[PDB]
Every structure is written in structure tokens, then in C-alpha cells.
Design an enzyme around this catalytic site. Sequence first.
Site, PDB file in Angstrom:
ATOM      1  N   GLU A 171      44.590 -49.388  46.160  1.00 21.07           N
ATOM      2  CA  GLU A 171      44.120 -49.402  44.796  1.00 21.07           C
ATOM      3  C   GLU A 171      44.418 -50.765  44.186  1.00 21.07           C
ATOM      4  O   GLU A 171      45.441 -51.365  44.477  1.00 21.07           O
ATOM      5  CB  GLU A 171      44.829 -48.321  43.991  1.00 21.07           C
ATOM      6  CG  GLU A 171      44.749 -46.961  44.626  1.00 21.07           C
ATOM      7  CD  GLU A 171      45.816 -46.031  44.104  1.00 21.07           C
ATOM      8  OE1 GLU A 171      46.926 -46.521  43.807  1.00 21.07           O
ATOM      9  OE2 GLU A 171      45.538 -44.827  43.985  1.00 21.07           O
TER      10      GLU A 171
ATOM     11  N   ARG B  80      46.608 -36.249  36.167  1.00 19.46           N
ATOM     12  CA  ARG B  80      46.939 -37.462  36.879  1.00 19.46           C
ATOM     13  C   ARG B  80      45.835 -38.481  36.694  1.00 19.46           C
ATOM     14  O   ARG B  80      44.709 -38.159  36.298  1.00 19.46           O
ATOM     15  CB  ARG B  80      47.186 -37.195  38.375  1.00 19.46           C
ATOM     16  CG  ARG B  80      48.598 -36.663  38.715  1.00 19.46           C
ATOM     17  CD  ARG B  80      49.114 -37.184  40.049  1.00 19.46           C
ATOM     18  NE  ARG B  80      49.392 -38.622  39.922  1.00 19.46           N
ATOM     19  CZ  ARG B  80      49.575 -39.465  40.934  1.00 19.46           C
ATOM     20  NH1 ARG B  80      49.519 -39.044  42.197  1.00 19.46           N
ATOM     21  NH2 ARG B  80      49.829 -40.746  40.672  1.00 19.46           N
TER      22      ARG B  80
ATOM     23  N   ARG C 277      47.730 -52.992  45.020  1.00 20.60           N
ATOM     24  CA  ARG C 277      48.826 -52.153  45.511  1.00 20.60           C
ATOM     25  C   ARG C 277      49.048 -52.387  46.994  1.00 20.60           C
ATOM     26  O   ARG C 277      48.105 -52.316  47.806  1.00 20.60           O
ATOM     27  CB  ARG C 277      48.515 -50.671  45.252  1.00 20.60           C
ATOM     28  CG  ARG C 277      49.452 -49.708  45.928  1.00 20.60           C
ATOM     29  CD  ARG C 277      49.156 -48.250  45.533  1.00 20.60           C
ATOM     30  NE  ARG C 277      49.858 -47.313  46.394  1.00 20.60           N
ATOM     31  CZ  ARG C 277      49.891 -45.989  46.191  1.00 20.60           C
ATOM     32  NH1 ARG C 277      49.271 -45.469  45.152  1.00 20.60           N
ATOM     33  NH2 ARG C 277      50.555 -45.204  47.025  1.00 20.60           N
TER      34      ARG C 277
ATOM     35  N   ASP D  64      46.165 -34.344  45.394  1.00 17.63           N
ATOM     36  CA  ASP D  64      44.837 -34.979  45.329  1.00 17.63           C
ATOM     37  C   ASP D  64      43.754 -34.109  45.956  1.00 17.63           C
ATOM     38  O   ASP D  64      42.918 -34.565  46.755  1.00 17.63           O
ATOM     39  CB  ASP D  64      44.918 -36.336  46.024  1.00 17.63           C
ATOM     40  CG  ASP D  64      45.956 -37.231  45.387  1.00 17.63           C
ATOM     41  OD1 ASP D  64      45.658 -37.806  44.334  1.00 17.63           O
ATOM     42  OD2 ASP D  64      47.055 -37.358  45.943  1.00 17.63           O
TER      43      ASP D  64
HETATM   44  C1  LIG Z   1      44.286 -42.009  50.135  1.00 13.89           C
HETATM   45  C2  LIG Z   1      45.483 -42.872  49.807  1.00 13.89           C
HETATM   46  C3  LIG Z   1      46.709 -42.065  49.377  1.00 13.89           C
HETATM   47  C4  LIG Z   1      47.277 -41.289  50.566  1.00 13.89           C
HETATM   48  C5  LIG Z   1      48.231 -42.135  51.380  1.00 13.89           C
HETATM   49  O1  LIG Z   1      46.370 -41.133  48.341  1.00 13.89           O
HETATM   50  C6  LIG Z   1      46.385 -41.693  47.026  1.00 13.89           C
HETATM   51  C7  LIG Z   1      47.816 -41.750  46.545  1.00 13.89           C
HETATM   52  C8  LIG Z   1      48.191 -41.503  45.277  1.00 13.89           C
HETATM   53  C9  LIG Z   1      49.571 -41.851  44.871  1.00 13.89           C
HETATM   54  O2  LIG Z   1      50.223 -42.675  45.535  1.00 13.89           O
HETATM   55  O3  LIG Z   1      50.067 -41.322  43.866  1.00 13.89           O
HETATM   56  C10 LIG Z   1      47.232 -40.870  44.270  1.00 13.89           C
HETATM   57  C11 LIG Z   1      45.760 -41.114  44.647  1.00 13.89           C
HETATM   58  N1  LIG Z   1      44.884 -40.299  43.793  1.00 13.89           N
HETATM   59  C12 LIG Z   1      45.532 -40.794  46.125  1.00 13.89           C
HETATM   60  N2  LIG Z   1      44.130 -40.945  46.512  1.00 13.89           N
HETATM   61  C13 LIG Z   1      43.428 -40.062  47.224  1.00 13.89           C
HETATM   62  C14 LIG Z   1      42.050 -40.508  47.641  1.00 13.89           C
HETATM   63  O4  LIG Z   1      43.852 -38.968  47.529  1.00 13.89           O
END
Ligand SMILES: CCC(CC)O[C@@H]1C=C(C(=O)O)C[C@H](N)[C@H]1NC(C)=O
Lengths: 470, 470
Positions: B326, B26, B342, B51
Site C-alpha cells: 500500500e 476499517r 509501506r 479482510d
Molecule cells: C493482501 C495484503 C495483506 C495480507 C498480508 O492484507 C492487507 C493488510 C492489512 C493490514 O495490514 O492491516 C489490511 C488490508 N485491508 C489488507 N488487504 C487485503 C487485500 O486483504
Amino acid sequence: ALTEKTDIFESGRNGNPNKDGIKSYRIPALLKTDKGTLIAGADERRLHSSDWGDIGMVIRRSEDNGKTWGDRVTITNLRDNPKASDPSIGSPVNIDMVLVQDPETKRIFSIYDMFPEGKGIFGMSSQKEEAYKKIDGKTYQILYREGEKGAYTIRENGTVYTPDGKATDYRVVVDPVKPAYSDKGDLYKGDQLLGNIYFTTNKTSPFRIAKDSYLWMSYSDDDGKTWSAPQDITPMVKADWMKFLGVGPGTGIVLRNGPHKGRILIPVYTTNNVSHLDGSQSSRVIYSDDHGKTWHAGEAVNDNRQVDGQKIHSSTMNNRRAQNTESTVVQLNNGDVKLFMRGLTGDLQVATSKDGGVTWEKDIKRYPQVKDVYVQMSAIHTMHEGKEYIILSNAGGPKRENGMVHLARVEENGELTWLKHNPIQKGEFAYNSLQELGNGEYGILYEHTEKGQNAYTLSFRKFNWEFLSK
Amino acid sequence: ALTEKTDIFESGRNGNPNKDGIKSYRIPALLKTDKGTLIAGADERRLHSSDWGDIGMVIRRSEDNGKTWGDRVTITNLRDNPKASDPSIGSPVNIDMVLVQDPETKRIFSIYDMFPEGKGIFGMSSQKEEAYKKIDGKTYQILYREGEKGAYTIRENGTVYTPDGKATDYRVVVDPVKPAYSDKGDLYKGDQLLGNIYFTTNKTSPFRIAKDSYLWMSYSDDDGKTWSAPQDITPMVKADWMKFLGVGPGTGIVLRNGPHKGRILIPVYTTNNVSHLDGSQSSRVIYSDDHGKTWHAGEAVNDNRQVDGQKIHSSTMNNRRAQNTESTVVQLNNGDVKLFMRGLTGDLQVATSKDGGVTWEKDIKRYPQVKDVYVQMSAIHTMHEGKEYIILSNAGGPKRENGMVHLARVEENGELTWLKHNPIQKGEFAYNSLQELGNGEYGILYEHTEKGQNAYTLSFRKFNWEFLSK
Ligand SMILES: CCC(CC)O[C@@H]1C=C(C(=O)O)C[C@H](N)[C@H]1NC(C)=O
Ligand SMILES: CCC(CC)O[C@@H]1C=C(C(=O)O)C[C@H](N)[C@H]1NC(C)=O
Ligand SMILES: [Cl-]
Ligand SMILES: [Cl-]
């Protein structure tokens, strides 16, 4: 054994101002100085008894151990906003002082809260407004200009700089010169006075400070007769996460023994943005190791404290009954620091620090022997016939009434044993401040009312060991 | 005009590990270097697609513009806790990288998140655990010992000091030497390995770090072939109020013009303790002006931002719809920095900074021409003939599907005129990273699945101006 009361700061009666135009006095602090002088400090609450409005930080001096008292000396009195719709909340606010003298320099400090115009602590913004900016290593207080997002700054000589770092022709009075420093914060465009940076409503100038919570200090080098301009110590001690930071009023201490001898300790407490006044009020001390020039925040009693089998931290907690608020601080002969904290258990809560007030032992000790009706208290160290004691005064209850003086023996392991509990004032009784006067005598300055007096009149009594032993 | 897809990091199928024993890849990052090399980075998610777990930070190099790719190079791979009951949350975690090269020093940076053992961000402590302490001007990482309240510190050479400042016989591997730095955090007493400071369950050693959120940096001085040990940049950038602080994955930028030319920009985002992931995700950048030696946090787009008639701040907000997460960052020829974020509006949200990414204008611009399905995106500046453009790629929707490449003319004032919207990948499509290849050519690394591939396989396609223009 116990003197009759002497009224030091007299409130008005039946909701009227007194003869000086003052409705209320609140928040006593009492300090016996190196010259033997007694300084009695208070909030001079002109318009009403609440923790906001037009309030002056004032003291009176007694040169005969509390028998007679001089004229009121006003330390700081910020001018009101003349255009405020509600004068009751229409003034920048100072409230709640802690007095302490440095025994090496003889400099006397009054440290107290400040808020810009509004309902005191209740006037703080609901969302964080940044109050300071660090720019090329220097910390500057921020100004917000109407209709603009950016952070202006108050730099050297009070010159206002744009968010982009350009000097303007606006200037803030950072070196106030009027009686009681009432010009502090005045905002000028060149020669013209436009308004004041502490005004938050119906403004006549473009700029205000953040609607946040501040800590100011004023000092006296002449036994309390005259006072410096206020010094803004906030950025030295207030972490970004802290919402409120303010003093636990009364009289601070200087450590007299151990590796941190000479350190000045000032009780304060904080709230966080998670639960603010509902669940995060947390005691700690700020301290100075350089005779009041620089200040540092100790850790909270509540930091990494175990409550109901789970850890909390002052920055993140939301637990009404784990709160601890205004406190009074004492060092023992063995070097330990005890912090007696206002709280919501109904009895006396005490924390211990073995490192000069920087961190706290894991357990808060409770003493069912001493009730706490959720009100400020004061406590002092004393020696009697080679033995070590703590005297603590607060309301006996059930409400803010029946003033008590409690006597504890300090045991050889630093624990406390409550020996005596004696009434000092029937009827209304709230905040108070104790001092040793010497020759087995003690003094107290306290909040009480009678005969229609507004909350409160601050009165003084002396007592001796015979009173304590009853 | 558009190459066929070439799979760079291949996931397993139907929920099984691939031939290398890896279920998932990923979080693509694509970097065109000064030598012309393409560096493709990803999370190598061994046990599952989430994650957390056992994740390595990896890259592959291509020295012929995406035609052939070398062996995987592992930047960092912390060892798992061999005693964890649930191996799926049983390892210290790294996830989400941003790549960037300093065009002056040629040093290449990979900046990514780190959490101690647990469910990644969901393993953070519910109450604040302090992660660092400043002592004698120096900042040290904290260790917590079972059954003890105080903060041990990791000091010079990895030597653990007691809360009261005494050196112990314990030491931390602070200069790891094993492949992929898998010994980082190992806890020794003398020469005996006892455990690891990143382990949080079923520990064999007395100590762990705060269960917080960290930012690490690794760099390469040989065009991505070999990488330094991880550098903990967290204390440089993470404020006391921040809960989460993590990268907006993809490829950062170096400012190429204006007063801040040379500044390295890395998109990140934070949460606060008031509303955490529910109402506080807020984009900003961290930056370096000294070729990556020291790092600073810019302000959040959300700081002092007006939303439905009221101000918010990233440290106190609780507003799901006002979040921005992000992001991808682009500098214009006029010097402005655009931050594509985002968010939860269903369309493209863009912030503007006039001061090199430090502060943001009061309005967030929304472009209904570009859908945003709440997923990472990437965007790059490009000159063509020689007019200024932005290329942005994300999912066309309605779900994480239908990869689109969007073309904007950038106007002289920095407004974006969206000209073309071209599909680049039917079916599943998520995170992605664009780069300019030169000669009117562009390369992209993106997440996509087909044929029962686990989320995700990361693939690479080249396109030219001909594809962009219709
Ligand atoms: C922390 C924000 C979100 C949870 C709502 O997770 C993100 C979502 C992601 C996603 O929407 O695919 C992938 C990111 N790698 C992830 N980041 C972390 C730090 O885990
Ligand atoms: C802010 C804590 C508490 C909320 C009821 O107010 C304190 C209570 C007081 C009280 O219980 O009498 C008086 C204090 N001077 C006040 N402090 C401030 C800062 O206003
Ligand atoms: Cl004004
Ligand atoms: Cl361990």
C-alpha cells in the site's frame, strides 16, 4: 516397400566438423509442396549439437520426390558475436522450425525460435525483462542501454527512441539485406556500425534486446527457393506471463474441413515463471485465419485441466508429469483436431479440440500401444481405400533408438486404434517428420547416426502401404 | 491547534457487535471536495475485523469541516451467500477504498477491491482461473459451470453465452437496482432468481466467476450523496500474470501541473504467481487521463529495479525485503511524483516518477527520520507562506501505536527535508487519511481503539500549522 536411406544433411564424424565446417544437423521438417517439391528443413548446427551456438535455418529441395536434392538454401543465419568469450554460446540463436504451406496462396512458412546471444533457452534472464512496449497502439521492441533502467524502443525504420519518447541518432537494421539476413539487429549510430542488439556480452554498442524467448517467421513465395527477411511474430502470441514460447518442430497443417477450413495450425509450447522447465511445459497451437499475416495463441491443453482431482493452468502449474511439450497436429475428417504431445508418461498422449485448435477437451487420451521415450514425434492424416488413418513416427526405445512407424485407424467416433508398429531405422533415432507423397507413398526425414557420425545426420526414406501393413 | 477526537465510524466493544450490529470499521479515506464537503469513507465490517466477510463500502459527509456528520451512505454492499456453511467467509467481499475527485468534472471516485465469496484475497484459486475473454474485439467476464471445462461469457444485457458462443436463457444482473447494489451478480433464468455469480460454495445456480482479484469503481456526481452502480475496471489494468491487484487505501490525487496535469492517480499493488504474498507485493499506480473513463496501469516501482546487485521485476520477484505494498502518492511543484510505500525496512521508503507516475527511478529513497512499522500511511502536498511542504501520517511505533504527523520541506529537486515529528494519538493507531482543509488547517481520519473497542474505531481530528511546527 521401404527405400534405403538417403542422407540429406550430413553431420561430421568423431566430433569433427564435416567438409562444410558443420559439426551437427538437428530438427528435421519435411514438406511436400503444391508443385510436388519436397522441402527438407533443419537446424545447421555449426559448432556442436546443442540447442545454442551458431545455427542456421536451412532447407534443401527435391524436385523428383526425394531422389535428388539441390543446394542448401539458408533461410536465416544471425551473425555471431565476434567478441564472445565462449564461442559455443557466442551467437544469437535460431532453433527448431515448423514448415507449412498455405494451400490457397501457396506461401510457404518456416516458423522457428529465436534467442539473443547466450545458451539458447538457458540464456533467458532469471527475472523477467520486458521485451515489447505498446505505445499509442503500436507495439515496439524494447532496448536496454548499459547503466540505465528505462526501456528504449525500436520504432519505424529502426530508429531508436529514448524511454521518454525522443528519437536518437541510433538505428537498428530492421530491414536486413545480407545473405541469410546476418545483418539483422545490427546497431548503427548514423553511418557507423557499432554492434548488434542481439549481442549480450562484451558488447561494442550500448543496446540489447530483452534476454527472453522469441518466435520468428520467414516465408517463401517461390517453392522454397528464396525467403523473406524474418518476421517477429512474438508479440502477436506471447502473453506477459509466458517465459518460454517455442515451436514443436516438424510440419504444421492447414485445416481442410469444417468452419475453420483454411486456418493454419502451428504446434508450440510454453513455460511459466513459477516452475519453468521443471513443471510447466505445456502444448498448444498458434494459428492464422488470414493466410499467415496475423497469428493468435490457442489455449493450452493444460488450461483448466483436471490433474489428480485438482485444476491446473499452464500459467501457474508446477507438475512435472502433467507437462506436455513438442507436439504434432492432425485434423480428422469429422473436423476434430488431434494433438500428439511429447510427455513423461512413457506412452503416447493425445489431446482433442472440437473448435479448430482453440480449446481442448477435458481428457488427454493415453495409448500404451505406442511408447514415448520423451522425444519429438510426427503424425499425419492419410486415407487408404476410402478408410481414414493416422501414421505416427517416433523412437521405439528404450532410448532414442529403433525408429518406428505406427499406424492407427481413425474410428467413427474419432478414437484411435493402433493396428501396426514397424521399424524403419535400427540404431539411433530421434526427431522426424512425415509427409504423404501421393500414390500410396510416404516420406520421412529423420535423425539418426552411424559410423561415428555426430548427432545427427538427417536422412530420408520412402515407404508404401505394404510397409505399413507388415 | 489540535481538536479532540470525534468518532466517525464506531466499532463494537470486547468482540461484540456495536448497536447497529457491526463489529468493526476499517480502512479510512478522507476527501475534501470542491464544495468544501468532507467525505469520510471506510469498510463497514459487520461480522469481524478481518479482510473478508460481509463488508459494505460506506461514507459520511460533513458540510461544516468535520464538526457535524450526516447519515452513513452505502456505496456498495454485495449480498451474502445465504447457504454458506461459515458466514464469516460467506459473502462476496469488497474491501479497501481510494477516494478522489476530478477537479474539472467534479465527479468523485471510490475505487476498491472485490473478491467473490470466500476468505477475501485468501480465497483466490491456487491455480489461475481466467476471469475475462476477448471475443470479436469485446471483453467479457467469464463464468464457470459445475462439471464443465469451458468458459461461458456474460455478454450484452447480462445474457450468458455458452463456450461455443450460443445465447442461453440465463442472465446476470449487470445493472443492479437494489439499495447498495446488493443484487449485483444475481443469476436469473427468465424471471426466476437462481443464485449469484459471486457465490462459490453451496450454490443454487450453475455459474460462478473466476476466484480472482478484481477492482471496482463507483462515482458520485452529487458531492458524495448518491453513487453509481459499481464499474468493473479490472480488465483495463490487470495483466495476465498478476495474481492480486488491489488498492493502496486512502485518497488519490489529480496531477496539478506538468505535461500530465489532469491525470488521476490511484495507488495499487500487485502480487505474482511465483511468490504471491511471500515475496512479490509491489506498488504502482493506475491512472486515468480522460476524467476516469478509461484506466491504465503504470509500471511497478519494482520493475527492472536493482536489489543487492541484481535486477528484479514485479512479475517474477521473490524477495520479501524488496516488497512495497500500500502506498500514498504526492505530486511536487517541480512535477515529480513521490510514492511513499509501506514496506519492510523499518523506515520510510519513497519512489520517484518523472513521467506522471508511469515509470519510476532506479533508486528507492529511505528516510530513517520516519519509522514505518509495516502499516498504511497517508501523505499530502501543502503550500504554506508560500513554501512547499509534505505532511505524512503513520504509526510512530514500536507497534501499530502512537500516531505521528510528519512535516517535510520539499526542496527544489524534490528531496524531502524532514522538519517536525508530532504525536497526534496515543495508544493504538493504524491506517489513516490526511486532507488539507484550508486556512492553514488540516483534517485526518484514522484507526484507533480504546476502552475495548474492536479494531477499529475511525476518528477525525483537525490541526493547524501551530501544531505542525513544534
Ligand atoms: C493482501 C495484503 C495483506 C495480507 C498480508 O492484507 C492487507 C493488510 C492489512 C493490514 O495490514 O492491516 C489490511 C488490508 N485491508 C489488507 N488487504 C487485503 C487485500 O486483504
Ligand atoms: C526447452 C525444452 C528442452 C529442454 C531439454 O529442449 C528441447 C529438447 C530437445 C531434445 O530433447 O532433443 C531439442 C529441442 N530443440 C530443445 N528445445 C530448445 C528450445 O532448446
Ligand atoms: Cl553490441
Ligand atoms: Cl449460486
